[PDB]
Every structure is written in C-alpha cells, then in structure tokens.
Write a protein that binds this ligand. Structure first.
Ligand SMILES: OC[C@H]1NC[C@@H](O)[C@@H]1O
Ligand SMILES: OC[C@H]1NC[C@@H](O)[C@@H]1O
Lengths: 804, 804
C-alpha cells in the first residue's frame, strides 16, 4: 500500500504463496478445513523465517572469513516484543506478504495480532537492549546479545476490582518459531564445590554441574542483509543425575532459566547471574580460539556489562585465564580490564547489588578468593595514589563491613573495566559527583556518557506508518537509518499542507486506539479530548502519584464550577508494579478508584476520563504512543537516569510535560525550551531541600486545593465502602515521601494549565509538535551505538550491504 | 540395490536431493561447513517425514468422510524402536533415498545408526502394541494408539564390573522429528476433590486440574498409503497455578508424564493411569460427536484395554455418560460393556493390579462410588445365577477384604467388557481353568483367544534384507503382507541352491554381528561357533538361571576332558532387570561372572564364549536375532503367556530350544514337533509337582554334575575375591525356587546335546531351519489383528490402497 514497506512484485508474491502452503501442509500438519487463524499466523511466520535464515547463515559465514572484533552484550533482560512485522520491514517483505496473504483470503494485520510478546524483559533496560541489537545489526557490527531464555517472562498483569493480579506468562505454550534450539552446543556450569591448592595453582572441585542449553534468535539489520544472533541460555540437568526420584529431581537444576525476576538477594538470582556469565564466557573463549595467545583477546573481544547483573564476568574471566589457561595474574588482569566495560542504568540505592560473603563462599568459593585478591591489589593502587586516606580505602573497598559482610558489585565493575558510562549527560555527571566520586578521582579517564536512544524502525516505521509516510513524501526514506535528517522538517513548520497532515495522522491514530479500547476492553472514550498518557513501571520515583493529584484537582475544579469550559481530557496510566512492592500496588488501586468516581459522575460527562491501561508491554506501547498528545515524564529530578519512553513520545507527535531529569534535559536542549513544558525542581533545588529537611506539612498548610485532596483521600471519598483504604498513601505523602510529590505540585498544576491553553489552538500545538519531531534525531539508537563503537569498543560502524 | 526396497527412479532421487538441502539449510540452520552426521540424519528424517504427512492428512480426511468404526488401543507402553527405515520401507523410498544420499557423499546406513530408540516401552507388551499399530495401518483400520509421552523412557542399561547400572534415557535431547505437538487440543484432567449430591445427580468438585497435551506420531501402513495416528499425552500445569514459587511448583503436575515405570502401587502410577484414561476418553467422545444419541456409540467406537492398566476407562466412561451426559445407569452400562474389551497379557500374580480403597477414595472419589455400584449390580447377577454360593460371591467381588481393603482391577475389567482374551491358546485355556474360572462359568461367551504375532515388516524385511531377498527370488513379494505364503517354501527344502543360500545369509548375518561386537564393545567372538542366544527381560520365570547352569556344565565337561571335541558355542544373554528386583540383578552379575572365568580360560580357547549383551532394546534385537542359530525359550510351563521374541527367531532362521509354554506350543504345532527342540515339564507335570511339594534337595542328591555346580557357586569359584557373593542364588535354588530350575535341568542338558549333534551336520540343520521359516506364517500380527477385528471389534480388514 505505502512507500515505506517495499515492492509487491510478481515473482516474490507468487513464491511466498507456495511457501505459505508448504508450511501449513508440511510444517504445521493442517489443511484449510482444520486451520485456525493461529495456524495461519504460524504459516506466515515460518515463511518469513525462511528469508531470515538464508541471510543469517551468510552473515556468520562472513564473520568467520573477515574475523572482526566481536561485541558481547550481556543483559538479564531482552524486551523484544513481537517479531513478525519487525522482520518483514527490515527485509522489505511487508508489501509482498500483504499482497500474498490477501490473494489467499487472509488479513495480515489480523494475523500479526496473534503473536505473543516475547516475555523476556521487564522495562527500560530490557527494551534498551532490544533497540541496541536492532541498531548493532543495522550498523554492521559483529555483535551478540547474551542472556537467559526465561520459560515464563514477566507476569501478565490482570486488574481485578482495581487490584493488580499476577499471572504466569506462558508465551511459549504454542512454540516460538523464531528461536532455534542448539542442543549440540550445551555447556557445563559449576556450583558449590571447594578449592584445592596444588604445586600447580588452584583447582575448583566437587562441583554440581548444571548444563546450559543455547537458543538462537536471528536479529535482522535494516535492509542491509546483516543478520546477527541473540543467544539465550536454558538450564538442563545432566544425564547421570529411588530411580524415579533421581529423574524427577532433574527439575531442580532446570529452575535456573524458569522465571525472570520482577534487586532481591535470593540464591536463585545469584545462580541465574552466574549461569549466564559462565556459559557466555565459555562460548566467547571457544569462538576466539577459532581465530594460544591471549594478548590479542582485547582486539578480538569486547564485553559490555549492564548494571551489576553480569559482574561475575570479571572474576570468571580471571578464573579461566589463571586457573585453566595458566596465565600470570598481572597479564590476565590486563586482558580482563581491556575486554570489559560497564554501563550503569540507574542510581537507585535499592538496585546496586551487594551480595553477602557467606553466600559467595558457599556457591562460588574460587570466585570469592579472586575477588579478595582483586580488592587487595586495587586497594594498593588507592593507598599509593592517596597516602594516608584511610576513609577513602574503606569507601572504595569491594568489601563492606558492619552487620553481614557484603561484596559491592558496582565497585568490582569499575575496578575491572576500562570504561564506565551513564546513560544520559546529567546521570553521568551525577555518577562523577556523588556515588562514584572516589573512583572518578582515581581514574578520570574511565568515565563517559552515552545518552540512551530508541530504534526508529520499531518506534516510527513499524508503530506509526501514517506519520512515516508523510515524512517520506517531503524528504524521502534516508531518515530511517539516519534520523538526524528529520531536521529538514524544520523548513516545513510554516507549510499549511504539512500542518494539516501531522494533525490528521494524530487523529487517525487516536480514533484507531479509541476503537481498540472499546473492542477488547469495552470502555468508552471521547476521541477529541487531549490524550494525556503516563506509561512506564509503577514506582514512587516515577511519581504516578503526582499525576493522580492533578487528575483530582481537575475533577474538583469541574465540580466547583461545572458550567465553566475545560479542555476535555483522557488521562491514561499504565504500568506493572513489582509483586512485593506494596506502595506501587496501592497506587494502581488509587488510579482505578479515581476512575470509578470520575468516569461515573454525570456532571463531568465526557470532559474527564481516567483509564488504567492493563498489562502494559511492548506491543501495547506500539499502539498507545502513536495516539498520544501529552507525554508525562515527571520523575523527581536526579532519579530517572535517562528514560526512553520519553524519546518514543517525542518521535511520535506528542508534546512533553516534564522535569529536568535524565534525557528530558537533552530533549529540551534539542527542541528548545520554548517547545517543551518544563516544570518543577532542578537537581540543585532537591539538594537544598534535602539539607533543610523535607516537610510535606508545610505544603498542606499553604495550598488549600492540596488540603482538600488529602482530606478526600483520608475520609473515604474514593473508597466509600472501605473509608480508610488509602491511609498508607496519605501517611507516606505526609511523613515519609522520599520523592517529594507535594513540593512539585503547584508548578505542575500551573504547567498543566499552559498545556491546556495551547491545545485550544490546534495550529500552534501542531507547529510545536513539528519542532519536536524534527529535532528527535539525536535520540536514535544508531547514534548511541555508533558512540559505543567508537569510544568504547574500538570498532567502526558500517552502512554497507551484504549480498542478497 | 535389492528388489524388496522399491524403484530408485529419475524424478524421485532428484526431488529428494533438493528437499534434503532445503531442510539442512532452512529447518536445521546449518551449512556443509558446520554440519555433523547428526544434522545429516535430521535432514533426511525431515525429508522423509514430508512424504508421510501428505498421506497422513489424506487418511484423516478420508476417515472424516467415510465415518468408520474407530478402534482405540490403550497401552502404557509403546516400544517403537527407530522410525526412519521403517518409514522408508513402508512408503517404498528406501532405494530412492539410498541413491539420493549417495549422490551427496553420504552413507545412509551410517545415518540410520544415529537415530535413538524411542524410549516408550519396556518389553513384550510394548513391542506387541508397536507391531499391532503397524498391522492395523497395513489392514486399513481406522485405529489410534493412545498412551503417555514419557519424557525419559525405560532406563539405559550400563554394566559396571558386572553390575547393572541404571541411567536416564534422554531420547528427546536433540528433539523428535517424527512427533507433532498439538497444544491447541489440550485437555483438563481432574484429581482429588469431593462428591456433592444434588436434586440433579452427583457432581465432582474442588478438583486439582492437570492439563494433558497431545503429541501425534504418524503410523504408516505397508505400501497402502494409509497413515494412522499414535497420540501420546504430556502433562502441563495450568496458567493460574511467593510468585516465584507458584511458577516453580508447576513442575509437580508435569511429573505425571516424566518417567515410565520399570506393578508398584505408588500414587504417581495411579495418576499416570487415570491421566491417560481421562484425556483419551474425552478425545474419543469429542471425535464421536462429530459424526446426542449414545446408542450408536458401540457401532462407532471400540476401546481395547491392555492389562489392568487402563481399567479406569470403565468407571470413567460411566462417570461421563451418567454425571455429564445424563443417561440412566442401565443404558450407560449397556454402552460401556459393548464398547470395551480386555486383553490379559500374563498370569503373574505380581502384575494383576489391586489398589487400596483409601487411595481411590482420596484421588478419585466419584470413581470409587461408581465401582461400588458396579460391584453391587454385578454381585446380584452372580447371586441370581448361583443361589447360595457365598464363597463365589466373595471370590468374584471387585472388593477384597482382609488387612487393607483393595479393588481387584482385573475383576472390574471382566465385568465391564464384552470380550476377554488371552494371548496364546494355552494361556487362554489357563485363564478359563484357573484364575478366571468363576467369571468363565458365569459368562462363557466373553472368553476368547488371540495368539500374539509380530510384524513381518520390521522383523523380516527391515532387520534381515538378505533373507527377505532370497525368499522373494523364489516366491515374489506378496508374502510381506500375507506371511502364510511362506508355506510355498516347503517345496524347496530339498533344493540344493536354496539350502546353500539360507546358510550363506545366516553366515553373513553372523559375520556382520561378530564385527559389531568388536567395534562398539571390543570383545572377540568366533563366527563359526553356534550362536546361542537368550534375549528378553531378566526374570526368574524366564529362567536365565537354567541357561547359566548349562553354560557351567559345558565348561566343566571341557575342563574334565579338554582334548575331546565339542561343537563350539557363543552363549549370548541380554535383558534388563527391574531396578528393585534384587534377584534379577544378581543373575546378571552371575552371567558376567561366568564370562570372566570362561572367556579367560586358555584350555577352553574359542570353544566357549559367554557374552552379556548390554542395553537390550528394539534396535539391538534387530541386529542379534538375524544372527542367531539357537533361540532360548525356556520359561517354566504355565508362566510365559505367549512370548514374541520366539516368533522373531523362528522367522529369522534360528532353531528353538523350548518348553511347551505360551506360543511355543503353537510354533511346534505349525512346524511339527520333529523340527523343534522341546524339553521338560508340561503344565500338568508342574501341577503334580506342586501338589507333592517341590524339593530341590532331591535333584542335588541324584545328579552329581548339578552338585558340582552348586559347590562351585557356594565356594567362590566364580567370585574369588568375594567367596560368598552368590549365596542368595544358591539359597533360592535350594529352598525357595518358585520356578523349579533343578527339575528341568537333566532334560534341558540332554536336549542341548541333540542341538549340538544336529549342528555338526550343516545340511540337516538348514533343512530344519527351512521347515521353521516356511511355517511361521501364523505368527504374523496381520493374522492376529484380522482376528481382533472380526471377532471382537466388528470391523472388516481391508488390503485396498488409498490414492498416492
Ligand atoms: O538505562 C535504561 C533505563 N534505566 C533507568 C532509565 O532511566 C533508563 O532509561
Ligand atoms: O502379551 C504380551 C506378553 N505378555 C507376556 C508374554 O508372554 C507376552 O508375549
């Protein structure tokens, strides 16, 4: 249909049709009589997979020949979403498949909707890694994603009477046609045991052996015929493991790759972490030996560590080079530091892993020895650089004293890596000034920034084809792999035909999403209202509560002056809470409770709707973001390391209400502050407040509108049958608010009125939109990856094709 | 190469080659560079599978149209062996594939050897069901095998210092290309719960739901284009089943289809049994409704129950018809009796399932109620037929008193079935006279015989192509689906060219197997010796111990007169012992212990070898039976219900040494007693001995040669480092021998001398062989199945093709 999807020729369409029939017939073992839409989805998925694998074989063939420096991206989270459309777009098969399935009496869009989201990630970190794989392939890097094939992803979220219910994600129930099991490349991973010393170094012995089975998923670049590999590890018990009981207990080892953790210091967590690290490192070493001399290892291998999760890669690499390959400490260490780099994804104190010594002792005794020995040599470097600074010595130690003895894994990461980066400028500055100040003063050259990005493939071409077409009409298709080219849309801010087109696309997207809400969730929304959307994980730092306070203000204002005009709004909030995070679960209930009162008040009518979006995930993100008018990015300054949803919204025609936090600062810098709704405390202001002490009572005393809301919550206004249901929320807001919701309330409400004012003038809104879209180029993951490649890994990106 | 495999044409071979490459490329995701022989095996297996599925679809399509009476064969054992060659032969693809793989630089025979045996059965019962599926498809019956997809089969047997070690059978490690998972046809199976009564009948409530997932395996008929289905059930936990623990405990439900039991009254056993029954019955009912009126059910459905294992099918069918479909008792019962039939496979007291009431109460409360109610109505039938016979009432009851209360499942089987059969004439007679006398006197018309059979496809054409070719040269190919035609070989017993050919085939088979022993197991055997082979499960009734006593006699005779001529022999014994069957495990050790002494005695030389065959299984049976001269079938009279190995040997050119037990009686009747080495007690003689009382001491007192052997065993002759190792064996032989080994010793040794005498005259041996092969026609499973079809199920077999 459109230009951004490819050619629907004569030979391709005819050839696709007979491969569809072949897979339905031979692969699926069905005919037209018993074939359900799911079988049709599988037949198409298998047919498209055929074109991937041909390119996949050639790519790995190619890397064998050229022998380039290999990048290893290690994450415990790969938040992939659906694969079919992404695959069709990157291979230029979308129109051929659409025409081909049409000629068969099939709707392709109906088929796409049957694919389950890969349950392989939680949130930002996981989606980031997905965007990166896409970018890495698009830029011709010989890169590998490595992680765990969780049998059950992050839970599916169901709402029952306003409460989050968790239910298992059986995304694999019907099979995954994209993955290829590789049982022939299975690998031992060791646990417990003991250390023995011999005239010939240390030996790890009497170990429980868990086997690690790899599944491979192809990762297609954008129209460059490069197809990289994402390799995911599954746990499988060994074969010599009454007789019936020995076979049943094989389940115990296989529990490692069973569930993604929604930092909780459980053993199973540590085991997952070592599991992915150990198998991955064996694979990396094996691949390098098919190039003896580990001097060249850093020129052939780059390993990127994402948060403290794969931190054990450092002692593990040491263990292999020292105990097994017989290299001297100093040489092994030189190789480890040059190979590894460390990205920090968030400063949240409750996410920087600190393991108890008594646990590493039991589970990985040799690793503890290596850590102690790393710590010792590192501390002599500190001692010699800062003579007499004993407090620095204990601050910088990898070992923490007091209560239980712990190993700070972030400190390990810094010591054993040649580069350390944060994920947006302000965040990387914060690392340098606060939590890693000591390490920065010792090695200022390790510390870099790499502002996060999103892929324009999924996050524009795939999810918003309408917008993608009108851009291409004016400036052509080159922007898809070079998003900076969107600057050229600046010369169109005054063009009347373009203003109308941007506004029409937005309204089409809104109408569409409005109709999805009704069909699948029977809830009725006004499509000409302002689509006010906050979508991300539920957490107090993200301050869904601040949004809640605004929604109630608008409602109270409508009740006070009902016959006075207000810009209508649909307020949408979606996100999962962590299962044991009580406050987050209460917030969800608060939101749905506000909906119950507001959506059923006749005096309000269709002027305010509060909708909770159930089971927020990648594929729901692809539907809601194109339809949004207002992006809520309202974390307390200094808490959101970057964010990436914000970039998704910028790129899709939403204006942003936000604090100067994470990437917001750089988004506002790129579009100009005038084109951005910035409100609230900067980082400096939060610090000043922290010094004097935060007293929420003061805000309750001076702001009558806020006082009313607190009273309403306390007295059961939003919970008539359980008057004191939100007592924990009120009590937290009043006495124990770490994120200072009340302090940003006034300026947030004031900013919101300005958002409303501007929306009454559609023409000016849309011009402001154009200025955002036109300046979103910096936020491409192509740009991010290009920077990692040049400043960290030491490989040159490439835009060159591989033969078809 | 040969005529019995098909045409290797021009279009087929060319077309097979590009499908081989397609699966290697696209299915396997490999190229010539990384492709191991296993990948080549998988590429061929996938290519041949393509031709199956085309016929598979049409067959089920066909049955939908014609709507024939459907046969359901229920077994907890399906002992399938390898599938590739069987598949090639039945489709007539063997020569096309051989030529096709040759043109690619591949040896097909090398590839065949990479396929693992389906770990889905234990022994006779399991192999019987396999032969039957083959026969049912060959004879055009709309039949379905139903059972459990055990994740780990029967253990693999390893010998370590003469002892059986059990190790898990991970036959699925690399995947099974023959099966098709069907997640879309998953089914609930209920456990525990309670019964509630309502104005509207009984209700089963508060049940644990285990889900039952079906895997389908195609079952090709012989060159008739019929392809039936074998459906196997896998356990999978439900979706609403801290949060981490709820996901891990999903393993508990999935333990149902985890391991085949090597009758042990465990709960997990009962659960497996109910599991297969419940899901199977739901499937049967569903299929019948796509024909309201359950009067026609018996005309559309036949269910065959194999031993007491699927006995719960009877109360389960009642439960569905009464509680769910709302039929009256009497009508439901009429339907159940007409649908079900029961085969008994062995009279072994320790294999007739008797479950404790307290267990059925807990696990299946409604089923217990239905059983009690069945028992009540059945006992009124007994009371009215035999007025005043109270002991008959308690003998015939489904409920047993004393100690723990038990349900006799065999009694249930008889009451709720319209036919009951044994598996060889003598065995069916025994059922009528002894263990089911009471039931026979009440309903003489239920009781039938159906002598077991083997398939000539696997057990001649597949395993012995050499013999298959020389037969076809003289009489053509028609015998493969009509084995009675072997009678025509009678007119050849005096033909000189045929005598030589039979003898040459045998020697080729022997040379071949001799060379397999050396390569894979480095053990050196004389190929001109008499190949004396006893292969079957190790059990005292099978009397491997009697064979052992002969081997030691021969050895002692050689030591006494070393320079006297004896017909050289290789004595081969193979078989698995049940893990907790102590005596059987000791017997194995005894056999290997005899080997240690005998194979290393210089004075013996290559005149006697004792080899234990490790890990006896279907594919080893396919190698050893063609190579055998002497078939040991030496169970105590009245203990072997039929046997089937015996028929395998008869058909492959071995003479038989045996007791008049099971099918031996009918084999001797068909070939004439003169052409058979019958020895020992008949059934009548065992009875007479049982009456007087068995005193083994008496035989030890009168037979000096036997006395010597006992002394040797006791004094540590075969166990020098552990003198008293075989004390349990001696002690059992002497005081607690239930199978009367000593009583058959003299006549067994005497018979063995006659076997030896005849072997010195090769020409007469081979003529006697011809007379056996020529009369083995009755033992075809085609004949057996034809009889089940006509006398039990009420369907007419057919030899007609389906379109190609
Ligand atoms: O770096 C991935 C994510 N970590 C926390 C967010 O601020 C950031 O986008
Ligand atoms: O009927 C299957 C098997 N049960 C015991 C054996 O005698 C018989 O072949």
């Amino acid at each position: 249909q459109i230009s951004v999807r490819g050619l629907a020729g004569v030979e391709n369409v005819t050839e696709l049709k007979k491969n569809f029939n072949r897979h339905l017939h031979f692969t699926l073992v069905k005919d037209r009589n018993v074939a359900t839409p799911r079988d049709y989805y599988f037949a198409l998925a298998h047919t498209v997979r055929d074109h991937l694998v041909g390119r996949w074989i050639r790519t790995q063939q190619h890397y064998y020949e050229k022998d380039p420096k290999r990048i290893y991206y290690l994450s415990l989270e790969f938040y992939m979403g659906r694969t079919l459309q992404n695959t069709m777009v990157n291979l230029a098969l979308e129109n051929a498949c659409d025409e081909a399935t049409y000629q068969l009496g099939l709707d392709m869009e109906e088929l796409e909707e049957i694919e389950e989201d890969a349950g392989l990630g939680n949130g930002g970190l996981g989606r980031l890694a997905a965007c990166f794989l896409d970018s890495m392939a698009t830029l011709g890097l010989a890169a590998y994603g490595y992680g765990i094939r969780y049998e059950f992803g992050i839970f599916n979220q169901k709402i029952c009477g306003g409460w989050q219910m968790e239910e298992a994600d059986d995304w694999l129930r019907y099979g995954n046609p994209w993955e290829k099991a590789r049982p022939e490349f299975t690998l031992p991973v060791h646990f417990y045991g003991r250390v023995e010393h011999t005239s010939q170094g240390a030996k790890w012995v009497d170990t429980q052996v868990v086997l690690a089975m790899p599944y491979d998923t192809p990762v297609p670049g954008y129209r460059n015929n490069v197809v990289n590999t994402m390799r995911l590890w599954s746990a499988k018990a060994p074969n010599d493991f009454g007789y019936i009981q020995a076979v049943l207990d094989r389940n115990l080892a296989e529990n490692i790759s069973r569930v993604l953790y929604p930092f909780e210091g459980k053993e199973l967590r540590l085991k997952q972490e070592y599991f992915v690290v150990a198998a991955t490192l064996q694979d990396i070493i094996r691949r390098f030996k098919s190039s003896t001399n580990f001097d060249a290892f850093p020129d052939k291998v780059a390993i990127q560590l994402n948060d403290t999760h794969p931190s054990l890669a450092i002692p593990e690499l040491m263990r292999v080079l020292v105990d097994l390959e017989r290299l001297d400490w100093d040489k092994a260490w030189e190789v480890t530091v040059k190979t590894c780099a460390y990205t920090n994804h968030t400063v949240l104190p409750e996410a920087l892993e600190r393991w108890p010594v008594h646990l590493l002792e039991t589970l990985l005794p040799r690793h503890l020895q290596i850590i102690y020995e790393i710590n010792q040599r590192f501390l002599n470097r500190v001692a010699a650089a800062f003579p007499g600074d004993v407090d620095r010595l204990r601050r910088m130690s990898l070992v923490e004293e007091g209560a239980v003895k712990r190993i700070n894994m972030a400190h390990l990461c810094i010591a054993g890596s040649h580069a350390v980066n944060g994920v947006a400028r302000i965040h990387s500055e914060i690392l340098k000034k606060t939590i890693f100040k000591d390490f920065y003063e010792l090695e200022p050259h390790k510390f870099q920034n790499k502002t996060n990005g999103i892929t324009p493939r999924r996050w524009l071409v795939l999810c918003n084809p309408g917008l993608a077409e009108i851009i291409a009409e004016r400036i052509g298709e080159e922007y898809i792999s070079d998003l900076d080219q969107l600057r050229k849309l600046l010369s169109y801010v005054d063009d009347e035909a373009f203003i109308r087109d941007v506004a029409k696309v937005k309204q089409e997207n809104k109408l569409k999403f409005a109709a999805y809400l009704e069909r699948e969730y029977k809830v009725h929304i006004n499509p000409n209202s302002l689509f006010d959307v906050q979508v991300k994980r539920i957490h107090e730092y993200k301050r869904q509560l601040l949004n809640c306070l605004h929604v109630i203000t608008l409602y109270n204002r409508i009740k006070k002056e009902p016959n006075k005009f207000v810009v209508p709004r649909t307020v949408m909030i979606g996100g999962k809470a962590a299962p044991g995070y009580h406050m987050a679960k209460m917030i969800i209930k608060l939101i749905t409770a506000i909906g119950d009162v507001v959506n059923h008040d006749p005096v309000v009518g269709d002027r305010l709707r509060v909708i909770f979006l159930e089971n927020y995930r990648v594929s729901l993100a692809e539907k809601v973001i194109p339809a949004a008018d207002l992006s809520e990015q309202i974390s307390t300054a200094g808490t959101e390391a970057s964010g990436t949803g914000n970039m998704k919204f910028m790129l899709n025609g939403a204006l942003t209400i936000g604090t100067m936090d994470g990437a917001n600062v750089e988004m506002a810098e790129e579009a100009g502050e005038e084109n951005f709704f910035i409100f609230g405390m900067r980082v400096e202001d939060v610090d000043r407040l922290d010094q004097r002490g935060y007293n929420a009572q003061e805000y309750y005393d001076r702001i009558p509108e806020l006082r009313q809301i607190i009273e309403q919550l306390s007295s059961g206004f939003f919970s008539p049958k359980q008057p004191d249901l939100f007592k924990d929320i009120v009590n937290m807001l009043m006495h124990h608010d770490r994120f200072k919701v009340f302090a940003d309330y006034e300026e947030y409400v004031k900013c919101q009125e300005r958002v409303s004012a501007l929306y009454k003038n559609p023409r000016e809104w849309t011009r402001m939109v154009i200025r955002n879209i036109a300046t979103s180029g910096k936020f491409s993951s192509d740009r991010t990856i290009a920077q990692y490649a040049r400043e960290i890994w030491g490989v040159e990106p490439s835009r060159q094709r591989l033969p078809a």
